[PDB]
């Protein structure tokens, strides 16, 4: 019933917010729609897999908030396997390599690839993390799709295809679905192209021992009966002295403030009194989430390692259901597995099949790419299609179609009277990730602490000390990477 | 409590559906979120204006369903004033004209304009009204914005600027916001470029005497206590024998079937048990409505008529808050008024101002365009910003961003167990309009009648006889309009003769 703050949503962001407020001495209640916490993180446990992350899983250097929160909760990380060679599968053929980037051998193609990645980061440097709509060319870039940008930038089909895969993999959406400004912001605020795409020294470096779901679970343990499961919020009334929050199961909660810790568009599931301001009213209809199926195929042994393959596959082409895989074997070396993502339109297309049909397609693909008949003998399979989730809307995160970020972006975390906004979408560093969830939840919590006069304004946004366990190596470039001309640059020189 | 069909939403579509089912002998309930019926139609009444449509207003030839329904309810239409000259205001200067389209004199610009409109309709012919995703080049066209298409097609800035205004006016959205496939479908399913843009012989020909809100109001009168106002639906449960529909004000309704007659994205405001299928779950997060403020400035007299201007202004340029106006004077010749739309990004930008500030900007614009100091002397003002409406989401209708229509379009009116889908967005002829609302409401109703075994399958979709009161003249082209080359066409012709 009555409390200081109601947090709507028990994902990592809502839980991080609730924990901070609880630790500060406030009475908090978390209202969670599902029969579980964790939201876009979910760790399944059974005998066949021990545990498996079916949602958010990967963490790495520069994600210091999620690492600090998890450590405090008693969790540990381990390193995703990248000892052996990676594979780039191009036009029906596998090409093993080392380092974060699949090599290019044709000279013109090399220049084009080099320029593409470089230009992505160049453009990102002009985009403020906390205000992408303030980029000098914000409107120009927001009014183009990533498809249009790639069409302009890539003078080779090779570069265009790999860039397309990159977009699909990053934001689980098609290049023609997303704003160029938004996508460039997204990459920049994860620390740039190298940082986001890398396993070693990047966002995919590590996983939590026992699963990422433990973060939300362990905070629920700390908060006790303050977390209310199967309480979907349906109504928020701010017309009176205290805010009134009503749930589907006919309960009423009364609070001084509310944190909305749900995906922006899922604010549509709540009826507001008074109505939301115009800009937020329309914003929450303009911000869909991506489409992905996360699939994990289990094997007797990590057989790929014997062939000097680490399990990472970058797989070109329409026919391939999965464009990207990582080794998902346990740190102990058992429960051997390959994790793959079915991305964007392919998640839509292949959802029509049965679980068994998808397994067969994945195994046959992996057999081809790994050049191993062993891939045809799975021992177990788990998958999760996030497109079906009423209380997520998709995964990994919210994307912005052309024109939306500039027109509506400033609304995202603007308070509405006594409602403050958390959720990974509102983060300024690793938005879209578990790291962003923690940043946004803790910032939203501190906005309320400031509103209550408990902390000064300059304490709302707080820096995070670097993890001692997961140190970040700086991202470097070579002289030639910096100064080699683009394809049109070479042509102008000629 | 218990009934045959619950209709969610008391706009024209829900009301049309409810009426058909009621007339067929079924027990229906309409659950309406607002304290009024009509939804995206709203007729304000006060002593200063008598009545004024602040939402949907215009009807015209080929919109036979809304005309038939309104006539049955005892309503009449009158013709929007188009007696005197129209104005095209370009680069700070007004150019009076007659006909649906502003004349273009420059031979190159003329070829470009002619080719643009022609190509829009050409492409439209490849798009099935009931299945736009089945167009031969559906994916190619859906993966481009209208901005990209205009950039490719228009070899002159003049054509590009007018085409841009056209898109903004049609779908209250920016060219870069919307799919080319979807926009081409939208225009084609309203009968093409000429039909959609025209006053005489087009969608803007007429208004209802007394306002369009009377359609929903008079159906409510017919249904009596079956319409429940201030009942926002929050929950639909289909796990049991009968469907359970719950409202915000703590009421439960039980039905054999449900019609969802709300804008597609507003389905998000309902919690579903079991969850929606994957495609619909995601579809309803991908389909925003446009942004518009409808503004009506009142004057002592329709002074523009004295200068041989009918009141229609097509106003290009970023500085103009309103890009399009029509005379909104009553058929009696009193309550003189100009209606203007503030479109797309400008609805967002100018919402920051006060009502008085917007009135001043509109009057100053009109004074310039009409070359008339009288425009600076308004006697009254009404406006409605539809962007602020929780239970509309915007106006006029739902638009599809690039990639969505091909991936999710087939889901739009696909039943979900015992839920059927009405609403103008699901229409196949004049979707986006009051006409489409009627088509979709009656089709959804008949889907349920068929499900109950009351009518055969071939009676689900029903043709409509042409109105005797509002006959449609066919859309015609000239020989030159059909065969004149595009700009690149002319250049290729020059290339070959030079070679
Ligand atoms: C799904 C997913 C997947 C599959 C994957 C992934 C992901 C995901 N990610 C993301 C994450 O997960 C996120 O971000 C997070 O989690 C978020 O959080 P938040 O913010 O908190 O949110 P959520 O969770 O959603 O929560 C919410 C809540 O709420 C609730 N609700 C709703 N509604 C309502 C409610 N309540 C009450 N009432 C109402 N009304 C719900 O239920 C919930 O609970 C991620 N992340 C990270 O970090 N990591 C990872 O890994 C992930 N993932 C992914 C990744 C990928 N990667 C890849 C590989 C290679 C590459 C890439 C990328 C890029 C480059 C390269
Ligand atoms: C807004 C608007 C404006 C401003 C204008 C216009 C319009 C609009 N339009 C459109 C119409 O209005 C529409 O379409 C209709 O109305 C629709 O109907 P429906 O489908 O039925 O829907 P609604 O109304 O929305 O209804 C719904 C209902 O439901 C309810 N809800 C929600 N949610 C819920 C509920 N309930 C319970 N629960 C829940 N949850 C609500 O409340 C409602 O009631 C139009 N149309 C026509 O026809 N006409 C006209 O006029 C119009 N408008 C416009 C126009 C323009 N024009 C222009 C000029 C020149 C040109 C143009 C265009 C193109 C070319 C040229």
Curated annotation (Swiss-Prot), chain A:
GO terms for biological process: dopamine catabolic process; hydrogen peroxide biosynthetic process; substantia nigra development. Coiled coil: none annotated. This is Amine oxidase [flavin-containing] B. The keyword Acetylation applies. GO terms for molecular function: electron transfer activity; flavin adenine dinucleotide binding; monoamine oxidase activity; primary methylamine oxidase activity. The modification N6-acetyllysine is found at residue 50. It comes from the Eukaryota. The modification S-8alpha-FAD cysteine is found at residue 395. The record marks 154, 363, 380 as: Important for catalytic activity. Monomer, homo- or heterodimer (containing two subunits of similar size). Each subunit contains a covalently bound flavin. Enzymatically active as monomer. It is found in: Mitochondrion outer membrane. One of its GO terms (cellular component) is mitochondrial envelope. Belongs to the flavin monoamine oxidase family. Its EC number is 1.4.3.21, 1.4.3.4. The keyword ATP-binding does not apply. It comes from Homo sapiens. InterPro entries: Amino_oxidase (IPR002937), FAD/NAD-bd_sf (IPR036188), Flavin_amine_oxidase (IPR001613), Flavin_MAO (IPR050703).
């Amino acid at each position: 019933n009555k409390c200081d703050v109601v947090v709507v949503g028990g994902g990592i962001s809502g839980m991080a917010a609730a924990k901070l407020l609880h630790d500060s001495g406030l009475n908090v209640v978390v209202l969670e729609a599902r029969d579980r916490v964790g939201g876009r993180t979910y760790t399944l446990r059974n005998q066949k897999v021990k545990y498996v992350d079916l949602g958010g899983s990967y963490v790495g250097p520069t994600q210091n908030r999620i690492l600090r929160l998890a450590k405090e909760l008693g969790l540990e990380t381990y390193k995703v396997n990248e000892v052996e060679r990676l594979i780039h599968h191009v036009k029906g053929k596998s090409y093993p390599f080392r380092g974060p980037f699949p090599p290019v051998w044709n000279p013109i193609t090399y220049l084009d690839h080099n320029n593409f990645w470089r230009t992505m980061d160049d453009m990102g440097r002009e985009i403020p993390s906390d205000a992408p709509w303030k980029a000098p060319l914000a409107e120009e870039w927001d009014n183009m799709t990533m498809k249009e940008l790639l069409d302009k930038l890539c003078w080779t089909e090779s570069a265009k295809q790999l860039a397309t895969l990159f977009v699909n993999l990053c934001v689980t959406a098609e290049t023609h679905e997303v704003s160029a400004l938004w996508f460039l912001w997204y990459v920049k605020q994860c620390g740039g192209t190298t940082r986001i795409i890398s396993t070693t020294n990047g966002g995919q470096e590590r996983k939590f021992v026992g699963g990422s779901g433990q973060v939300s679970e362990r905070i629920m343990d700390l908060l006790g009966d303050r977390v209310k499961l199967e309480r979907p919020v349906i109504y928020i009334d701010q017309t009176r002295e205290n805010v009134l929050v009503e749930t589907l199961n006919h309960e009423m909660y009364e609070a001084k403030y509310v944190i909305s810790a749900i995906p922006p568009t899922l604010g549509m599931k709540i009826h507001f009194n008074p109505p939301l301001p115009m800009m937020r009213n329309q914003m929450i209809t303009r911000v869909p989430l991506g489409s992905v199926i996360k699939c994990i195929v289990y094997y007797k042994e990590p057989f790929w390692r014997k062939k000097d393959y680490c399990g990472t596959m970058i797989i070109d082409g329409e026919e391939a259901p999965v464009a990207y895989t990582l080794d998902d074997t346990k740190p102990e070396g058992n429960y051997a597995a390959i994790m793959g993502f079915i991305l964007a339109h392919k998640a839509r297309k292949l959802a029509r099949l049965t679980k068994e049909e998808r397994l067969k397609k994945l195994c046959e693909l992996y057999a081809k790419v790994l050049g191993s008949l062993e891939a045809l003998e799975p021992v177990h399979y788990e998958e999760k299609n996030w497109c079906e989730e009423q209380y997520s809307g998709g995964c990994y995160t919210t994307y912005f179609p052309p024109g939306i970020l500039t027109q509506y972006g400033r609304v995202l975390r603007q308070p509405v009277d006594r409602i403050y906004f958390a959720g990974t979408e509102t983060a300024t560093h690793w938005s879209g990730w578990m790291e962003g969830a923690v940043e946004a939840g803790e910032r939203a919590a501190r906005e309320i602490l400031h509103a209550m006069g408990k902390i000064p304004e300059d304490e709302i946004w707080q820096s995070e000390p670097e993890s001692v366990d997961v140190p970040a190596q700086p991202i470097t470039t070579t002289f030639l990477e910096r100064h080699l001309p683009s394809v049109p640059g070479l042509l102008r020189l000629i």
